[model samples]
Target: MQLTPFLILLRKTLEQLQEKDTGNIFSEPVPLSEVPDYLDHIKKPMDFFTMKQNLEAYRYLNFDDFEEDFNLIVSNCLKYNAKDTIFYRAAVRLREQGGAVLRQARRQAEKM
Candidate 1:
C-alpha cells in the first residue's frame, strides 16, 4: 500500500481520538498566556489540531510518524502536569485510548 490508504486511516484515528477526549481538553493547543511556564517544561507543545494540520499537510511518511506526535501530546501533558491534576488524568486516558486507537488502525488495514 501507498501513502493514501495510511493517510485515510490516520485521519480516522485522529477523529476518533478527538471524539474520545472528554471535556474537549486535548482538542486544541494550550494557552501559553494562561500557563506562562508551560513552555518552560514542555519543550514541544502538541495538540489534536496540530496533528490534524500535520496530517493535512502530508507530513507523516508512515503510521509511526503520526504515532510519535500522538504520543508526544500525552507525554508533554503528563510531564507538565501533576498526577493528581485533571490534565494528568486526561493524558493518561488518551495514552490508553489512543494506543488502542492506533492499534486498531494498524490491524484494520489488513482487511480486504
Candidate 2:
C-alpha cells in the first residue's frame, strides 16, 4: 500500500486505540520515576504518543511496522506488570481489542 493511505488508516487505528485507553495507561511513556527500571527492562518502550510521532514522521514502511510497536506496547505492559494488575489486564485487552482494529485496518487497506 502507498504511504498516504497507510498513514490515514494507521492514524485512524491509533485514534481508536487512544479512545480505548479509558484508564489512559498506554497514552504516554512510562515515567522513569514511577517504573524506575522500566527503561532497563523494556529497552525500547513504545507508547501512543511516540507512535503518533513516528506516524507523522513517516518512520514506518508499512502497517506491519506500526503493528510491531503496537504489539510491543501491549507486550511490554504484560511483561512488566502482573496479570492481576490493571496494566497487565489493559494490555491483555488491547491485544484482543486493539488487535481487531489493526486487522480491520490492514484489510481495509488491502481492499482499497
Error of 1 at 63 (Å): 0.7
In candidate 2, what are the lDDT values of residues 13-99, reduced to their tens digit?
899988878888989998888778787778789999999999999987687898999999998999899888988988888888887
TM-score of 1: 0.92
Query: In candidate 1, residue 89 scores what lDDT?
Result: 94
Backbone clashes, each candidate = 0, 0
Instruction: Look at candidate 1 and give me any clashing residue pairs.
Output: none
**Superposed model 2: Cα runs more than 4 Å off:** none
lDDT string, candidate 1, 1-112, tens digits: 7778878888898899887797889888999999989988788899999999999999986778888998998999999999999999999998998888888887876551
Q: Go through the candidates in order and give each one's C-alpha lDDT.
A: 0.87, 0.87
Off by over 4 Å in 1: 110-112
